[PDB]
């Protein structure tokens, strides 16, 4: 499995690309990146510890 | 939470 159990910058957006939008945000426990827009956060927004579908849901 | 933001190329 592509995670070797190891927290790296990983982009998995609930879009199921690893595409860049021009913003991205990375998750505090898993460290993957999203586009924020698709998560309900901006670079105005960005919390210290935003949690990611992946781990909240 | 980390942070990035893009727009274009590099150049
Ligand atoms: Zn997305
Ligand atoms: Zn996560």
């Known amino acids: 499995g592509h995670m070797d159990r190891y927290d790296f910058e990983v982009v998995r957006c609930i879009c199921e690309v690893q595409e860049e939008n021009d913003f991205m945000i990375q998750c505090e426990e898993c460290q993957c990146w999203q586009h924020g827009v698709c998560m309900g956060l901006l670079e105005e927004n960005v919390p210290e510890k935003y949690t990611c579908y992946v781990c909240q849901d | ?11």
């Open chain 2, 1 to 11: 939470a980390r942070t990035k933001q893009t727009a274009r190329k590099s150049t």
